[PDB]
Design a binder for these strands. Structure first.
Ligand SMILES: Nc1ccn([C@H]2C[C@H](O)[C@@H](COP(=O)(O)NP(=O)(O)OP(=O)(O)O)O2)c(=O)n1
Ligand SMILES: [Mg+2]
Ligand SMILES: [Mg+2]
Length: 430
DNA sequence: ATGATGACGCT
DNA sequence: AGCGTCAT
């Protein structure tokens, strides 16, 4: 009882932009606003590959990874914006710059952890402490939570969505203990007030809408965020966890969407996260390892300790291109020309990064894929990154990979290359 | 023939 | 170091 920790020590939010690359293109081009529309890369192969989809287009069944020619069969009026192409490859600069707009606004509120191009975790524990003291001891109005859902409410003894949202919010607020500055539910509620402010600032200052989750840890905040996307935020309290997890497929929890989650399901013969509570910690560690077993034992009870790391900037800067099917690179000079294209984009990004962020990368990682292999990378080699010079980086990358060539000729490359990747890593202050 | 990314764990 | 998992 008195000594069982409940994982309620922190307030953590996750903010995730709604259909992010689409909103970037819709801000730029008002003709795309409030329309079914998608962002595509490489127009020549089947209209291009879809990498982002507006909610109007999702209603027709358009998804990521669809070819645009195929998406047009579901949604004949679908509008498209194409990713910029530079040096024969997709160039994601516009979306990285738009990401920086959002991450700089979030950082005014709390130190962030950049988790992807369009999301960040926030540890609001300290901001909440300070807002609680400024708040005297006065009630939190529903008006301060105009886009907040309380997961699991309403419950107990309306037929539209907004009606239900408010009924649940009313039940929550009506039962809150405001005189107790250490109540975790009160802390989450104040965290949600702050996230409303944060989301209003992002939309005001950028034009972009987003969703968010507010809970006691990263996994629950991430799960919470997706429950009422788009343009809404969701509070998942500790008390909401048993019911929420009772029908929650294991693969929906972050880090369990792959082979480990499949093995949890297969080895234990279960489907839902809540069902994990019936195993001892030792039993879970016996199947999945010490670290995973302890993580699962705590996570299925809503408890997780992974900190919000103070990191706003990516740790690596990389440039990648595939060469699928018949386009696989088969000669030495093809290989050199494309390494050079990659290296030129990398230099551009590295130089900008050194001026903006006062650091330099010191290691260059070169990765390739061979036709016939199975995996994301076939082979990775590093060397020193001592100069931001594209001809030197590309010459160096060739040097460290040039013996992967099984060909007995000089001018040919075998087995042909289906992917090249350059990645700058190991940053030092500058 | 989705692709272009990016963090982090195991060894 | 170099490989693999998981993720957007
Ligand atoms: N596999 C993926 C997933 C996302 N992305 C890019 C495009 C997306 O707009 C952006 C953010 O990914 P996301 O958060 O998973 N989805 P998106 O923001 O488009 O829509 P929501 O479902 O979050 O509203 O990363 C990508 O290029 N490849
Ligand atoms: Mg998003
Ligand atoms: Mg995201």
């Amino acid at each position: 009882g008195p000594h069982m920790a409940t994982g309620q020590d922190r307030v953590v939010a996750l903010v995730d932009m709604d259909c992010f690359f689409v909103q970037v293109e819709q801000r730029q081009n008002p003709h795309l606003r409030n329309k079914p529309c998608a962002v595509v890369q490489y127009k020549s192969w089947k209209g291009g590959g879809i990498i982002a989809v507006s909610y109007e287009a999702r209603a027709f069944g358009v998804t990521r990874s669809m070819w645009a020619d195929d998406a047009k069969k579901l949604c004949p009026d679908l509008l498209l914006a194409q990713v910029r192409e530079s040096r024969g490859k997709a160039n994601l600069t516009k979306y990285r710059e738009a990401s920086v707009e959002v991450m700089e606004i979030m950082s005014r509120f709390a130190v962030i952890e950049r988790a992807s191009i369009d999301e960040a975790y926030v540890d609001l524990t300290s901001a909440v402490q300070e807002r609680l003291q400024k708040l005297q001891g006065q009630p939190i109005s529903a008006d301060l939570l105009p886009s907040t859902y309380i997961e699991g409410l309403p419950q107990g003894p309306t037929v539209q969505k907004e009606g239900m949202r408010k009924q649940g919010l009313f039940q929550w607020l009506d039962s809150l203990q405001i005189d107790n500055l250490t109540s975790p539910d009160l802390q989450l509620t104040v965290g949600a007030v702050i996230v409303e402010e944060m989301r209003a600032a992002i939309e005001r200052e950028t034009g972009f809408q987003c969703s968010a989750g507010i809970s006691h840890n990263k996994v629950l905040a991430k799960l919470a965020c997706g429950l009422n996307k788009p343009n809404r935020q969701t509070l998942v309290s500790h008390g909401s966890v048993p019911q929420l997890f009772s029908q929650m497929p294991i693969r929906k929890i972050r880090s369990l969407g792959g082979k480990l989650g499949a093995s949890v399901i297969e080895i234990l013969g279960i489907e839902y996260m809540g069902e994990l509570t019936q195993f001892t910690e030792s039993q879970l560690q016996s199947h999945f390892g010490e670290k995973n077993g302890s993580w699962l034992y705590a996570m299925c009870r809503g408890i997780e300790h992974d900190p919000v790391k103070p990191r706003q900037l990516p740790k690596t800067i990389g440039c990648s291109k595939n060469f699928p099917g018949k386009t696989a690179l088969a000669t030495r000079e093809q290989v050199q020309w494309w390494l050079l294209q990659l290296a030129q984009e990398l230099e551009e990004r590295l130089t900008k990064d050194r001026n903006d962020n006062d650091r330099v990368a010191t290691q260059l990682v070169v990765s390739i894929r061979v036709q016939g292999d199975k995996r994301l990378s076939s082979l990775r080699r590093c060397c020193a990154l001592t100069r931001y010079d594209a001809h030197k980086m590309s010459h160096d990358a060739f040097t460290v990979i040039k013996n992967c060539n099984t060909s007995g000729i000089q001018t040919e490359w075998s087995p042909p290359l289906t992917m090249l990747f350059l990645c700058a890593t190991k940053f030092s202050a500058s």
